[PDB]
Write a protein that binds this DNA or RNA. Sequence first.
DNA 1: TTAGTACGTGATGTTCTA
DNA 2: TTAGAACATCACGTACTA
Lengths: 73, 73
Amino acid sequence: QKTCLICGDEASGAHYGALTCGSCKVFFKRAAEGKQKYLCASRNDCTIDKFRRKNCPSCRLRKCYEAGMTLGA
Amino acid sequence: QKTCLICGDEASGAHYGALTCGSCKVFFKRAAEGKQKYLCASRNDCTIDKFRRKNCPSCRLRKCYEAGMTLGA
DNA sequence: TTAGTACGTGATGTTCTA
DNA sequence: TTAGAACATCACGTACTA
Ligand SMILES: [Zn+2]
Ligand SMILES: [Zn+2]
Ligand SMILES: [Zn+2]
Ligand SMILES: [Zn+2]
Protein backbone atom coordinates (compact mmCIF):
# COMPACT_ATOMS: atom_id res chain seq x y z
CA GLN A 1 0.00 0.00 0.00
CA LYS A 2 1.97 2.88 -1.59
CA THR A 3 4.57 0.10 -2.18
CA CYS A 4 4.83 -1.99 -5.37
CA LEU A 5 3.77 -5.61 -4.86
CA ILE A 6 6.44 -6.90 -7.26
CA CYS A 7 9.58 -5.06 -6.19
CA GLY A 8 8.77 -2.93 -3.13
CA ASP A 9 9.45 0.35 -4.95
CA GLU A 10 7.02 3.22 -4.43
CA ALA A 11 3.77 2.32 -6.17
CA SER A 12 1.88 4.66 -8.52
CA GLY A 13 -1.56 3.03 -8.38
CA ALA A 14 -2.94 -0.23 -9.70
CA HIS A 15 -1.65 -1.41 -13.08
CA TYR A 16 -3.02 -4.37 -15.05
CA GLY A 17 -4.79 -5.47 -11.89
CA ALA A 18 -2.21 -5.04 -9.12
CA LEU A 19 -0.57 -2.30 -7.10
CA THR A 20 2.78 -1.71 -8.84
CA CYS A 21 5.40 0.92 -9.60
CA GLY A 22 5.77 2.40 -13.07
CA SER A 23 8.79 0.30 -14.02
CA CYS A 24 6.98 -2.94 -13.12
CA LYS A 25 3.90 -1.73 -15.05
CA VAL A 26 5.88 -1.30 -18.29
CA PHE A 27 7.99 -4.42 -17.68
CA PHE A 28 4.90 -6.59 -17.34
CA LYS A 29 3.42 -5.27 -20.58
CA ARG A 30 6.67 -5.88 -22.46
CA ALA A 31 7.29 -9.32 -20.94
CA ALA A 32 3.73 -10.65 -20.92
CA GLU A 33 3.23 -9.71 -24.59
CA GLY A 34 6.44 -11.23 -25.92
CA LYS A 35 6.78 -14.92 -26.72
CA GLN A 36 10.05 -14.96 -24.78
CA LYS A 37 11.28 -17.70 -22.52
CA TYR A 38 13.14 -16.12 -19.63
CA LEU A 39 15.71 -18.17 -17.72
CA CYS A 40 16.55 -17.72 -14.06
CA ALA A 41 20.26 -17.97 -13.28
CA SER A 42 19.64 -19.36 -9.77
CA ARG A 43 16.68 -21.26 -8.26
CA ASN A 44 13.53 -19.42 -9.49
CA ASP A 45 13.33 -17.58 -6.15
CA CYS A 46 15.41 -14.42 -6.69
CA THR A 47 14.82 -11.38 -4.50
CA ILE A 48 13.11 -8.73 -6.64
CA ASP A 49 13.63 -5.18 -5.30
CA LYS A 50 14.30 -1.71 -6.69
CA PHE A 51 17.97 -2.50 -7.30
CA ARG A 52 17.81 -6.21 -8.21
CA ARG A 53 14.61 -6.41 -10.29
CA LYS A 54 16.62 -5.88 -13.50
CA ASN A 55 18.59 -9.07 -12.93
CA CYS A 56 15.88 -11.68 -13.40
CA PRO A 57 12.92 -11.02 -15.72
CA SER A 58 11.88 -14.63 -15.13
CA CYS A 59 11.33 -14.22 -11.39
CA ARG A 60 10.03 -10.67 -11.83
CA LEU A 61 7.46 -11.89 -14.39
CA ARG A 62 6.50 -14.79 -12.14
CA LYS A 63 5.87 -12.31 -9.32
CA CYS A 64 3.73 -10.14 -11.60
CA TYR A 65 1.41 -13.06 -12.28
CA GLU A 66 1.41 -14.10 -8.62
CA ALA A 67 0.26 -10.59 -7.71
CA GLY A 68 -2.59 -10.97 -10.19
CA MET A 69 -1.43 -8.88 -13.14
CA THR A 70 -3.06 -9.70 -16.47
CA LEU A 71 -3.21 -8.28 -19.96
CA GLY A 72 -6.62 -9.74 -20.82
CA ALA A 73 -8.80 -7.40 -18.72
CA GLN B 1 41.50 -25.60 -23.61
CA LYS B 2 38.76 -24.07 -25.81
CA THR B 3 36.30 -23.26 -22.98
CA CYS B 4 35.70 -19.86 -21.37
CA LEU B 5 36.51 -20.27 -17.67
CA ILE B 6 33.78 -17.73 -16.79
CA CYS B 7 30.70 -18.72 -18.81
CA GLY B 8 31.59 -21.91 -20.69
CA ASP B 9 31.17 -20.30 -24.12
CA GLU B 10 33.84 -21.02 -26.71
CA ALA B 11 37.01 -19.32 -25.54
CA SER B 12 39.01 -16.99 -27.78
CA GLY B 13 42.35 -16.85 -25.96
CA ALA B 14 43.98 -15.72 -22.74
CA HIS B 15 42.40 -12.43 -21.68
CA TYR B 16 43.48 -10.35 -18.65
CA GLY B 17 45.07 -13.47 -17.18
CA ALA B 18 42.54 -16.22 -17.88
CA LEU B 19 41.11 -18.27 -20.72
CA THR B 20 37.79 -16.58 -21.62
CA CYS B 21 35.42 -15.89 -24.50
CA GLY B 22 35.24 -12.47 -26.14
CA SER B 23 32.14 -11.33 -24.26
CA CYS B 24 33.80 -12.07 -20.90
CA LYS B 25 37.01 -10.28 -21.94
CA VAL B 26 35.11 -6.99 -22.61
CA PHE B 27 32.82 -7.52 -19.62
CA PHE B 28 35.76 -7.86 -17.23
CA LYS B 29 37.48 -4.79 -18.64
CA ARG B 30 34.29 -2.76 -18.23
CA ALA B 31 33.38 -4.30 -14.86
CA ALA B 32 36.75 -3.97 -13.13
CA GLU B 33 37.29 -0.40 -14.46
CA GLY B 34 33.97 1.10 -13.39
CA LYS B 35 32.92 0.03 -9.86
CA GLN B 36 29.22 -0.44 -10.67
CA LYS B 37 28.85 -2.22 -7.29
CA TYR B 38 26.81 -4.91 -9.04
CA LEU B 39 24.24 -6.70 -6.86
CA CYS B 40 23.22 -10.36 -7.01
CA ALA B 41 19.47 -11.02 -6.68
CA SER B 42 20.05 -14.53 -5.25
CA ARG B 43 22.87 -15.96 -3.10
CA ASN B 44 26.10 -14.93 -4.85
CA ASP B 45 26.10 -18.32 -6.59
CA CYS B 46 24.25 -17.77 -9.90
CA THR B 47 24.82 -20.07 -12.87
CA ILE B 48 26.93 -18.19 -15.39
CA ASP B 49 26.60 -19.53 -18.92
CA LYS B 50 25.98 -18.29 -22.45
CA PHE B 51 22.24 -17.84 -21.80
CA ARG B 52 22.39 -16.57 -18.18
CA ARG B 53 25.59 -14.53 -17.94
CA LYS B 54 23.65 -11.31 -18.62
CA ASN B 55 21.41 -11.91 -15.58
CA CYS B 56 24.01 -11.45 -12.84
CA PRO B 57 27.01 -9.24 -13.58
CA SER B 58 27.88 -9.47 -9.88
CA CYS B 59 28.38 -13.24 -10.03
CA ARG B 60 29.99 -13.06 -13.49
CA LEU B 61 32.58 -10.61 -12.11
CA ARG B 62 33.07 -12.77 -9.01
CA LYS B 63 33.93 -15.64 -11.37
CA CYS B 64 36.37 -13.43 -13.29
CA TYR B 65 38.39 -12.65 -10.15
CA GLU B 66 38.20 -16.27 -8.98
CA ALA B 67 39.58 -17.32 -12.38
CA GLY B 68 42.58 -15.04 -11.83
CA MET B 69 41.69 -12.13 -14.07
CA THR B 70 43.29 -8.77 -13.34
CA LEU B 71 43.79 -5.45 -14.96
CA GLY B 72 47.49 -5.42 -14.11
CA ALA B 73 46.65 -2.69 -11.66
C1' DT C 1 -8.36 6.28 -12.45
C1' DT C 2 -4.15 4.28 -15.45
C1' DA C 3 -2.60 2.48 -20.17
C1' DG C 4 0.16 3.93 -23.97
C1' DT C 5 3.92 6.30 -26.28
C1' DA C 6 8.50 7.40 -26.87
C1' DC C 7 12.67 9.38 -24.98
C1' DG C 8 17.20 8.78 -22.88
C1' DT C 9 20.38 5.75 -20.50
C1' DG C 10 23.24 2.03 -20.00
C1' DA C 11 24.91 -3.02 -20.56
C1' DT C 12 26.03 -6.33 -23.97
C1' DG C 13 28.82 -8.67 -27.64
C1' DT C 14 30.89 -8.55 -31.62
C1' DT C 15 33.91 -6.51 -35.66
C1' DC C 16 37.53 -3.74 -36.32
C1' DT C 17 42.16 -1.54 -35.51
C1' DA C 18 45.76 -1.51 -33.51
C1' DT D 1 48.95 -13.30 -30.11
C1' DT D 2 45.74 -10.09 -27.35
C1' DA D 3 43.97 -5.17 -25.78
C1' DG D 4 40.83 -1.82 -26.54
C1' DA D 5 37.32 1.25 -29.19
C1' DA D 6 32.97 1.59 -31.72
C1' DC D 7 28.68 0.34 -33.42
C1' DA D 8 24.40 -2.00 -33.30
C1' DT D 9 21.12 -4.00 -30.49
C1' DC D 10 18.29 -4.41 -26.57
C1' DA D 11 16.37 -3.99 -21.68
C1' DC D 12 15.06 -0.67 -18.67
C1' DG D 13 12.58 3.31 -16.43
C1' DT D 14 10.73 7.89 -16.83
C1' DA D 15 7.78 12.00 -18.31
C1' DC D 16 3.94 13.17 -20.61
C1' DT D 17 -0.66 12.80 -22.64
C1' DA D 18 -5.11 11.46 -22.55
ZN1 LIG E 1 7.86 -2.55 -8.95
ZN1 LIG F 1 15.45 -15.65 -10.76
ZN1 LIG G 1 32.68 -16.26 -21.27
ZN1 LIG H 1 24.24 -13.75 -8.76
